[model samples]
Target: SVVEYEVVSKNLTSKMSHELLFSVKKRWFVKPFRHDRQLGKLHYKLLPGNYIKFGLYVLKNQDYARFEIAWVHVDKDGKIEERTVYSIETYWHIFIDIENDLNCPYVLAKFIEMRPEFHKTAWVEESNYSIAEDDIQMVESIKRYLERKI
Candidate 1:
């Protein structure tokens, strides 16, 4: 079974003019949130302005665990681009545990590795809060996804 969710940003900071989603796995790909089945490999793009809609779908009933985290960038003129934040199956366990979960730290490390500038300027406590709120449901989803029997 698979479940999908649409992610949108709220009051994005000015230091960052764009919002990017980086997966634990770097090879994830995706298609439009509400469109055909055409799939495309996700790559990096730091465009000036665009509406970034992140789509998350969990893949259960499989031998391994993984989440399909992908996004599409749409500009003012209706131009659209797609990409995936490739996530690994084992990494999911590292990030989605019930207690002492390392999801935030993992994201923090990735942010530091990929966009150190954000870490230098963004608020630490606020970012933690946001990440927690954002991931609460996801944790539940993964718990459910893994609970199924093969």
Candidate 2:
């Protein structure tokens, strides 16, 4: 099932990278990030933060955003082996909120103020992604348009 009808990828120092670690000097790797709208999910990642952001679509029409900073070592069969990681997750919650503007199942992550040991699973508050107050008209338009066929 195709989710987002269209996507936009522009190169710049996006707001998503504002608080990212080691991003300023390492311009080549971190400054550029990909924002792709896939079926039931939008995947974005940055090497500077060493993390990937996933916007998941589920239920009848429910949506939310989550992130994974943990690097999982997997076997050929995709079996879990080991996980090692670190970063400021507050940015994950922060970026997912505005990513759509750079543009939409969007659940707001919980415990945004406190960093949890579990990178993705621990923070779960199913809701809409954050956007500017003035952007509501377009956001609503997107919702309406997508609902037309889905």
Candidate 3:
């Protein structure tokens, strides 16, 4: 059953054109980058480095901003790195309600949609959705939230 929810889209203009690849083989994990309850903003750092940071936010209206997933690549001594930050808005064609799902699920979904080579099977299991693993922490977080009805 697909759930419908309101969405927010804000245009961001930048001149950076860079892309990073994510692999299930490559190590990744979830870190709470910043959690501001009062502001309803939460950022999660997914890394082996500050390689990726993904999260969502809630506005005063109780609606969501956009799902954000940034990719960065740092060179030796953390010097030269890709400055382009990615978002669902910039990389995908889906409206995600932060109140509805976790970043990992949607991130994976969009990824598979964009890159067929990275495709894996996904389906609902016991009323919760399941997909092939990339980052263990992401899958666990999705499981916990889905199981808890959050």
Please, what is the TM-score per model? 0.29, 0.20, 0.31
Give the CA lDDT, 0 to 100, for residue 27 in model 3.
Answer: 37
lDDT of 1 by residue, 33-146 (tens): 342112212233333232222222222222223434444555555465666633334332332342243443344233233221322311112131233324434434444543
Evaluate model 3: give its TM-score. Answer: 0.31
Candidate 2 Cα misplacement greater than 4 A, ranges: 1-67, 76-79, 91-93, 101-150
**What pairs collide in candidate 3?**
none
Candidate 3, superposed: residue stretches over 4 Å from native: 1-26, 30-50, 80-85, 89-150
- Arranged by lDDT with the best first, the candidates are 3, 1, 2
Worst 10 residues of 2 by lDDT: 15-24
Best by TM-score: 3
- Residues 1-150 of candidate 3: C-alpha lDDT, one tens digit per residue: 111111111122211111223323343322223433332233333323435433332232333333345445433443424343434331222223322444446544443332111111111112223335555565455445434433
**TM-score (C-alpha) between model 2 and the true structure:** 0.20
Q: Is candidate 1 or candidate 2 better by TM-score?
A: 1
Candidate 3: how many backbone clashes? 0
Go through the candidates in order and give the C-alpha RMSD of each one to the true structure. Answer: 15.6, 17.8, 15.4
